[PDB]
Scaffold this active site. Sequence first.
Site, PDB file in Angstrom:
ATOM      1  N   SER A 151     -47.767  -1.588 -36.456  1.00 31.91           N
ATOM      2  CA  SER A 151     -49.217  -1.593 -36.548  1.00 31.91           C
ATOM      3  C   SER A 151     -49.818  -2.985 -36.338  1.00 31.91           C
ATOM      4  O   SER A 151     -49.262  -3.998 -36.757  1.00 31.91           O
ATOM      5  CB  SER A 151     -49.661  -1.163 -37.960  1.00 31.91           C
ATOM      6  OG  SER A 151     -49.428   0.225 -38.140  1.00 31.91           O
ATOM      7  N   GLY A 152     -50.943  -2.988 -35.619  1.00 32.38           N
ATOM      8  CA  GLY A 152     -51.644  -4.226 -35.287  1.00 32.38           C
ATOM      9  C   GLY A 152     -51.144  -4.865 -34.002  1.00 32.38           C
ATOM     10  O   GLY A 152     -51.801  -5.772 -33.462  1.00 32.38           O
ATOM     11  N   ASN A 167     -36.770 -13.600 -33.925  1.00 36.11           N
ATOM     12  CA  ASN A 167     -35.934 -13.007 -34.968  1.00 36.11           C
ATOM     13  C   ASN A 167     -36.571 -13.289 -36.313  1.00 36.11           C
ATOM     14  O   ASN A 167     -36.734 -14.452 -36.685  1.00 36.11           O
ATOM     15  CB  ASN A 167     -34.529 -13.631 -34.920  1.00 36.11           C
ATOM     16  CG  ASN A 167     -33.545 -12.854 -35.783  1.00 36.11           C
ATOM     17  OD1 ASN A 167     -33.801 -12.600 -36.951  1.00 36.11           O
ATOM     18  ND2 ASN A 167     -32.394 -12.480 -35.234  1.00 36.11           N
ATOM     19  N   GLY A 217     -44.887  -0.943 -39.396  1.00 39.40           N
ATOM     20  CA  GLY A 217     -44.537  -2.349 -39.187  1.00 39.40           C
ATOM     21  C   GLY A 217     -44.889  -2.792 -37.765  1.00 39.40           C
ATOM     22  O   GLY A 217     -44.912  -3.998 -37.526  1.00 39.40           O
ATOM     23  N   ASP A 276     -60.036   0.690 -35.965  1.00 39.12           N
ATOM     24  CA  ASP A 276     -58.905   0.025 -36.608  1.00 39.12           C
ATOM     25  C   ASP A 276     -58.583  -1.271 -35.868  1.00 39.12           C
ATOM     26  O   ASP A 276     -57.646  -1.397 -35.062  1.00 39.12           O
ATOM     27  CB  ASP A 276     -57.693   0.968 -36.660  1.00 39.12           C
ATOM     28  CG  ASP A 276     -56.616   0.510 -37.617  1.00 39.12           C
ATOM     29  OD1 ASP A 276     -56.813  -0.521 -38.284  1.00 39.12           O
ATOM     30  OD2 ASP A 276     -55.538   1.176 -37.707  1.00 39.12           O
ATOM     31  N   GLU A 336     -40.681 -21.218 -33.452  1.00 38.57           N
ATOM     32  CA  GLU A 336     -41.799 -20.716 -34.252  1.00 38.57           C
ATOM     33  C   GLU A 336     -42.858 -21.747 -34.614  1.00 38.57           C
ATOM     34  O   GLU A 336     -42.552 -22.926 -34.821  1.00 38.57           O
ATOM     35  CB  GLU A 336     -41.249 -20.153 -35.576  1.00 38.57           C
ATOM     36  CG  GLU A 336     -40.164 -19.090 -35.408  1.00 38.57           C
ATOM     37  CD  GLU A 336     -38.749 -19.639 -35.465  1.00 38.57           C
ATOM     38  OE1 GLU A 336     -38.502 -20.759 -34.966  1.00 38.57           O
ATOM     39  OE2 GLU A 336     -37.853 -18.946 -36.000  1.00 38.57           O
ATOM     40  N   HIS A 359     -56.382  -1.915 -40.725  1.00 42.45           N
ATOM     41  CA  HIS A 359     -55.595  -1.416 -41.870  1.00 42.45           C
ATOM     42  C   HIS A 359     -54.491  -2.379 -42.282  1.00 42.45           C
ATOM     43  O   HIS A 359     -54.086  -2.350 -43.465  1.00 42.45           O
ATOM     44  CB  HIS A 359     -55.033  -0.034 -41.535  1.00 42.45           C
ATOM     45  CG  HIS A 359     -53.727   0.034 -40.821  1.00 42.45           C
ATOM     46  ND1 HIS A 359     -53.647   0.420 -39.480  1.00 42.45           N
ATOM     47  CD2 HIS A 359     -52.455  -0.185 -41.243  1.00 42.45           C
ATOM     48  CE1 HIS A 359     -52.376   0.418 -39.120  1.00 42.45           C
ATOM     49  NE2 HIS A 359     -51.639   0.058 -40.176  1.00 42.45           N
ATOM     50  N   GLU A 396     -42.214 -16.239 -32.443  1.00 39.14           N
ATOM     51  CA  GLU A 396     -41.243 -15.570 -33.297  1.00 39.14           C
ATOM     52  C   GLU A 396     -40.449 -14.569 -32.487  1.00 39.14           C
ATOM     53  O   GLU A 396     -41.018 -13.750 -31.768  1.00 39.14           O
ATOM     54  CB  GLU A 396     -42.002 -14.854 -34.432  1.00 39.14           C
ATOM     55  CG  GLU A 396     -41.116 -14.059 -35.387  1.00 39.14           C
ATOM     56  CD  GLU A 396     -40.280 -14.981 -36.266  1.00 39.14           C
ATOM     57  OE1 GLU A 396     -39.365 -15.645 -35.762  1.00 39.14           O
ATOM     58  OE2 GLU A 396     -40.603 -15.034 -37.471  1.00 39.14           O
ATOM     59  N   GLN A 406     -33.901 -15.420 -38.632  1.00 38.39           N
ATOM     60  CA  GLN A 406     -33.110 -16.552 -38.149  1.00 38.39           C
ATOM     61  C   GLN A 406     -34.033 -17.551 -37.452  1.00 38.39           C
ATOM     62  O   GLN A 406     -35.076 -17.187 -36.929  1.00 38.39           O
ATOM     63  CB  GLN A 406     -32.086 -16.068 -37.116  1.00 38.39           C
ATOM     64  CG  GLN A 406     -30.839 -15.475 -37.764  1.00 38.39           C
ATOM     65  CD  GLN A 406     -29.774 -15.032 -36.787  1.00 38.39           C
ATOM     66  OE1 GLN A 406     -28.659 -14.682 -37.191  1.00 38.39           O
ATOM     67  NE2 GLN A 406     -30.096 -15.048 -35.500  1.00 38.39           N
TER      68      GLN A 406
HETATM   69 NA    NA Z   1     -37.367 -16.639 -36.342  1.00 35.74          NA
END
Ligand code: NA
Length: 240
Positions: free
Chosen positions: A188-189, A61, A186, A93, A69, A45, A59, A64
């Site tokens: 989800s996944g 933040n 948010g 799903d 990353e 979804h 990741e 910031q």
């Molecule tokens: Na970041």
Amino acid sequence: VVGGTEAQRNSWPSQISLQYRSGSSWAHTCGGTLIRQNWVMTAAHCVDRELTFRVVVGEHNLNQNDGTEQYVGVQKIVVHPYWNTDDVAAGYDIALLRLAQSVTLNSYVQLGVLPRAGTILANNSPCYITGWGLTRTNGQLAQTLQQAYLPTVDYAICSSSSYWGSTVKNSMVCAGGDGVRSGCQGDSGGPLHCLVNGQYAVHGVTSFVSRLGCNVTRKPTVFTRVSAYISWINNVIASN
Ligand code: NA
Ligand SMILES: [Cl-]
């Protein structure tokens, strides 16, 4: 995540942020688990909309510079073929994302370990949900990755009338339901990490919460059961 705590920077290195292009910026929309250097496991979804997506590994933040990353575009999407967007209760799903580049591994970027096929956790098995989802029902996304301790709720209990009834399937994992902490939009996944024989494995892919609220007593967060899809995952990666 509602009722979570801030995760240490290197606790969950397989967690990724799945983002879509929004104007001249990128917006987080869902979590995911890095399962190969160029493959991510997320919820089907999350990629129903035909957007431009990217994955961020390393990741911590969303707002910031973490100094760790790696930003990588999504090159190909393989959604489970039995997924139906208007029937999330049917299950399925889950989707795999092939990345345009192979990310580099380090202490902030590692592959998630999956459970053995068919594994079902005993009721009340300790697990953590992780994610940048809303921190309150109808709230806002977290800036920093959150974790919340959500014990599993087995099928017999989860499918009882006061819990999720017929909506939950044996192809899903339920966790939490204490009315205080839970996944939320948010998340989800993303992963449900559970310690088995001293090692964490990603047993769930966050799929849904109640329409009445994220943290609702006897409405545990529901995840796609990763161990029901090991052959599917291996088959997709081998043919792509
Ligand atoms: Na970041
Ligand atoms: Cl991890």
